[PDB]
Write a protein that binds this ligand. Structure first.
Ligand SMILES: NC(=O)c1ccc[n+]([C@@H]2O[C@H](COP(=O)([O-])OP(=O)(O)OC[C@H]3O[C@@H](n4cnc5c(N)ncnc54)[C@H](OP(=O)(O)O)[C@@H]3O)[C@@H](O)[C@H]2O)c1
Ligand SMILES: NC(=O)c1ccc[n+]([C@@H]2O[C@H](COP(=O)([O-])OP(=O)(O)OC[C@H]3O[C@@H](n4cnc5c(N)ncnc54)[C@H](OP(=O)(O)O)[C@@H]3O)[C@@H](O)[C@H]2O)c1
Ligand SMILES: CCc1nc(N)nc(N)c1C#C[C@H](C)c1cc2c(c(-c3ccc(CN)cc3)c1)OCO2
Ligand SMILES: CCc1nc(N)nc(N)c1C#C[C@H](C)c1cc2c(c(-c3ccc(CN)cc3)c1)OCO2
Lengths: 157, 157
């Protein structure tokens, strides 16, 4: 089973400020919706609680507590290793969709990254990890919008 | 100016049947939406007449006749060459978006290809061109839907 990572980050590395994403770039959301359509997503419990089970996707959520979802479209796992083994029975592909913590824990597992860089330098306390040079860009496209953004796809080795 | 080309084709290469696209693969048009957002498209007259001028895009349309368009986001050119020369004064990137005729005439000038292959083999009368082997796949993702589809990004070597 292949692991992809999909994230949006500001030019200063910020991805979150408290429970919010500190920007609104018109259009960027389309990339995320289009590439995750009917895909399995892996997300942290805090991020899942912020966005909820939006339609046409399937969710694997990790928690260290007894937290549960209430939605037959979500599977809660006690660990990332357990989520990976569980998903592997059900799918060939999972897309890691965030939490700052989830990103840092799963970047080493990812063979493909989908990275939107937003032309803004906001304040926030949550940051995307440095992209290791075990990955390289194979595709890139710029978008002009109310806030501009650049979309890149990175592949491993 | 960069030239990309974006197309959805069935597994038998059909892209059209009269003025229609002969399938409904739920989800696939999101890829088209996301990648064309605030982009310039090059379309043929026949294709443009079918879809119409959806928002957040600019259109270059080519025709050999007296056909014109009201919409203020559309520029009509008499030839592919004039459209390319004209677009280059206006944009850094254009996305050829079809017509079988337009695809054949412009594939040689594209640096990047976005191809969705739809899991169907319908009857039709318009076909996508042979992809030269100067292009290679650098990304691929499978989608399950009512009709499955596979998204591939090709780059020219
Ligand atoms: N691309 C983006 O710009 C993007 C995307 C999504 C989110 N965000 C932002 O990121 C911020 C939230 O990130 P965050 O790091 O605070 O939270 P998070 O990663 O969404 O969730 C962290 C939680 O997930 C659970 N968890 C993490 N690793 C686990 C493991 N190995 N095993 C079991 N459970 C595990 C824990 O749940 P418990 O607390 O239940 O134990 C932990 O508290 C928000 O600001 C949000 O807006 C940005
Ligand atoms: N990716 C996809 O699956 C996709 C995308 C788009 C369209 N389609 C399908 O493709 C079919 C349409 O393709 P098509 O080949 O019949 O038509 P088309 O390529 O969309 O348009 C052909 C017309 O474009 C103009 N044209 C072409 N080359 C020109 C040139 N060198 N100089 C000036 N004008 C030029 C001419 O317009 P005039 O007749 O006005 O002179 C010509 O009749 C439809 O069925 C549509 O559903 C599929
Ligand atoms: C485009 C973002 C985006 N772009 C890219 N490149 N990669 C990504 N990983 C994400 C993302 C994301 C998160 C999971 C997300 C995705 C969403 C969300 C919301 C949302 C969260 C909280 C609230 C509460 N106020 C409302 C909505 C959150 O709503 C539509 O989809
Ligand atoms: C999107 C498919 C698609 N996917 C990919 N990868 N590449 C493409 N080049 C196209 C295409 C196309 C054509 C030009 C097209 C042809 C049409 C269309 C529409 C259309 C109709 C309704 C809506 C809803 N807003 C959006 C688009 C789009 O209406 C009938 O004729």
């Amino acid at each position: 089973m292949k692991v992809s990572l999909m994230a949006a980050k500001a030019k200063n590395g910020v991805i979150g400020c408290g429970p919010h994403i500190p920007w609104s770039a018109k259009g960027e959301q389309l990339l995320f919706k289009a590439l995750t359509y009917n895909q399995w997503l892996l997300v942290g419990r805090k991020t899942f609680e912020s966005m909820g089970a939006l339609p046409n996707r399937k969710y694997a959520v990790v928690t260290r507590s007894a937290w549960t979802a209430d939605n037959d479209n979500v599977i809660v796992f006690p660990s990332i290793e357990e989520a990976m083994y569980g998903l592997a029975e059900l799918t060939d592909h999972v897309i890691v969709s965030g939490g700052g913590e989830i990103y840092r824990e799963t970047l080493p597992m990812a063979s493909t990254l989908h990275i939107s860089t937003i032309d803004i330098e906001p304040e926030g306390d949550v940051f995307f990890p440095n992209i290791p040079n075990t990955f390289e860009v194979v595709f890139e496209q710029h978008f002009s919008s109310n806030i501009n953004y650049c979309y890149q796809i990175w592949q491993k080795g």
